[PDB]
Amino acid sequence: EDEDVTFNDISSLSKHVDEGLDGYRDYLIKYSDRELVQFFENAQLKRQYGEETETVKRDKDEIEKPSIFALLPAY
Amino acid sequence: QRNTMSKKELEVLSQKLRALMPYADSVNITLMDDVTAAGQAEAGLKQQALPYSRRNHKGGVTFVIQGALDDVEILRARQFVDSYYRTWGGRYVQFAIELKDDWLKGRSFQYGAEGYIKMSPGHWYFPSPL
């Protein structure tokens, strides 16, 4: 409800909206189980023909990356 | 090169050795060349095709053999070194043999004078010049 800032551009608006959902995104990520979340993320992207092996295991602050559309089923 | 003695001193040395060895009638002292020793060492490593590095010191030469050697290489090296040691002993030339894994475990890195190691995408280490 704060009209305290008005937006120069697409990215400024988009980020302002995005940062608002994080109170919900936290709650979903607290209780889902990350291995599913990542599995779905990699699946909606067509990447590397949808599933491929990983030689190396490397965790990339994946907590802030994950889309809500990935989080919901896992929860 | 590394010994400075007179003939008299050498004779005295001879006689004292003879006193230590009551079964020997005499001890013959022979002067050998350091350059010869070092050269025969390096020639043997080339002849065996082993990869190596050489380091020089005021009183010694060190050959460092390190990495992921194959079992044939390890066999050859063990045989050669064992032969050399029995001829020249271990005082002047030393052979350092080290099996070890590939450097930095298969991380990627920037190896200049300002190098660094990637831990993961998004993560830099900057530990030392590489």
UniProtKB/Swiss-Prot annotation, chain A:
Function recorded in the entry: Involved in a secretory pathway responsible for the surface presentation of determinants needed for the entry of Salmonella species into mammalian cells.
Protein name, as recorded: Surface presentation of antigens protein SpaP
Family: Belongs to the FliP/MopC/SpaP family.
Source species taxonomy: Bacteria, Pseudomonadati, Pseudomonadota, Gammaproteobacteria, Enterobacterales
Entry superkingdom: Bacteria
Residues of the full protein shown: 76 to 150 of 224
Subcellular localization: Cell membrane
From Swiss-Prot, chain B:
Subcellular location: Cell membrane
Domain of life per record: Bacteria
Disulfide cross-links: none
Function in brief: Required for invasion of epithelial cells.
UniProt-recorded name of the protein: Protein PrgH
This protein's encoding gene: prgH
Whole-protein coverage range: 263 to 392 of 392
